[PDB]
Write a protein that binds this ligand. Structure first.
Ligand code: ZN
Ligand code: ZN
Ligand code: ZN
Length: 473
């Protein structure tokens, strides 16, 4: 059984066998340092006659007596210097600074509408698809971004995203929706009805998830509010990764984020990729504000907006060691890019959905694509239109491609109207060609995409064929 260098367990709480040792010795009321000196006299790891409490973690804790040590007393956690091997799961990430804090007793909030909802992610299999990816939600259920379905949380790597100010977690509160109990219930009633597996201690009930320890504050509008009473900080307010496989993931986060300023490095041309779009969304108050923000976006505006927050420095050119290299297309489902803003959640969903393509025409795929996009947000269509037609959008997501590509027949009609002054009968074979191309379904989505960009901001082989047809009239 592995402990830290203060002989507390992997979950941050003291061990029963150590409390019994110190109690028999009459050291229970002593300060932490005196208790540890005693334990060392008993040979530390081998102070128990039935255990070998190998020390895996190095932690710095308050002097508070051992029996009163909790995850809320930790200030620093990292791998123990002489421990050769991989670490077991630990409540906090390694190489992290730990901070600690009805709602008025926690945050300077004027009303619940000023609280921000944290982004909680779990790495797990989606039953609906078979894919394994980072699903976004809370500590009870999460949504699979590929298909939009909800799955119950399972054991695996977990993370909380970048901490917003006044961070809360909003959970469906069955105690309030159950009309027999309703709002104004007692605390005991909430925890008995919620049905989720909390960690019960003499000091209350808490939840350990994604590098934070949450506690219950209160309810509003039949939702329960939890707050990260304790949270890790590995750099730029990121809370790191905990759970199976977290050690490798943390190494990737620490290399990039644990700096005085996080270097955002745009490699090659500045294109509004999925990764850049969500980084900018992180700084937008609302989805509607983001729609206005992305209009006319270029590198300079991106640099100014991102750097204005103080935690980042934006540069461009060649890839650099230790920098946040953006330009090679990487998955947006990661502990990195775990932004908690409203606009960021919409952007993540838009660029992560897939289509159920089965020999369908472009017109059919567009109808399905719009249905998906409308479900995500009523601004999703205006947001995509802005990114595509007032900026320089690039993606390989089929839902976004299907929505835009299906409109090429209307854009072509208007484009030909603008060039030649009206719609001519001689130009019908160009529209008829597109209608036949729509029968290719997925096979034409990339070809149409390039055509839309060509006419949108007015040469690839798909456009050379189309353009040659137009030049016949
Ligand atoms: Zn023991
Ligand atoms: Zn899925
Ligand atoms: Zn409630």
């Amino acid at each position: 059984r592995y402990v830290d260098n203060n002989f507390c367990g992997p979950d941050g709480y003291p061990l029963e066998c150590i409390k019994d040792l110190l109690a028999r010795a009459g050291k229970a009321s002593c300060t932490l340092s005196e208790q540890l000196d005693f334990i060392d006299t008993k040979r530390g790891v081998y102070c128990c006659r039935e255990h070998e409490h190998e020390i895996a973690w190095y932690t710095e804790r308050s002097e508070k007596s051992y029996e009163l040590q909790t995850p809320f007393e930790i200030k620093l956690a990292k791998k123990f210097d002489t421990f050769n091997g991989e670490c077991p799961n630990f409540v906090f990430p390694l190489n992290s600074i730990i901070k600690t804090i009805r709602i008025r007793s926690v945050y300077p909030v004027a009303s619940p509408n000023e609280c921000n909802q944290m982004c909680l992610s779990t790495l797990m299999k989606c039953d609906h698809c078979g894919e394994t990816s980072w699903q976004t939600g809370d500590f009870v259920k999460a949504t699979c971004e590929f298909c939009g379905t909800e799955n119950l949380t399972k054991e695996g790597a977990t993370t909380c995203g970048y901490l917003p100010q006044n961070a809360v977690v909003k959970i469906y509160c069955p105690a309030c929706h159950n009309s027999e109990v309703g709002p104004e219930h007692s605390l005991a009633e909430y925890h008995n009805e919620s049905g989720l597996k909390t960690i019960l201690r003499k000091g209350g009930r808490t939840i350990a998830f994604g590098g934070c320890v949450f506690s219950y504050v209160g309810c509003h509008n039949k939702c329960a509010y939890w707050v990260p009473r304790a949270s890790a900080n590995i750099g730029c307010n990121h809370t790191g990764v905990v759970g199976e496989g977290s050690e490798g993931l943390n190494d990737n986060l620490l290399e990039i984020l644990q700096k005085e300023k996080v270097n955002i490095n745009i490699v090659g041309d500045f294109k509004l990729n999925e990764e850049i779009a969500i980084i900018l969304a992180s700084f937008s108050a609302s989805t509607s504000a983001f729609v206005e923000t992305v209009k006319g976006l270029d590198y300079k505006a991106f640099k100014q907006i991102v750097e204005s927050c103080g935690n980042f420095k934006v540069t461009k050119g060649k890839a650099k060691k230790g920098a946040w290299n953006i330009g090679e297309q990487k998955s947006i489902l990661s502990p990195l890019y775990a932004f908690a803003s409203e606009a960021a959640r919409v952007v993540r969903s838009i660029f992560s959905r897939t289509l159920e393509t089965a020999q369908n025409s472009v017109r059919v795929l567009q109808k399905a694509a719009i249905t998906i996009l409308d479900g995500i947000s009523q601004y999703s269509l205006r947001l995509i239109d802005a990114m595509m037609f007032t900026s320089d959008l690039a993606t390989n997501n089929l839902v976004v491609m299907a929505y835009i590509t299906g409109g090429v027949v209307q854009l072509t009609s208007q484009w030909l109207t603008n060039i030649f002054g009206t719609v001519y009968e001689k130009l019908k074979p160009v529209l008829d060609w597109l209608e036949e191309k729509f029968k290719e379904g997925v096979e034409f989505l990339r070809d149409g995409w390039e055509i839309v960009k060509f006419i949108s901001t007015c040469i690839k082989e798909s456009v050379q064929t189309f353009f040659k047809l137009v030049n016949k009239f």
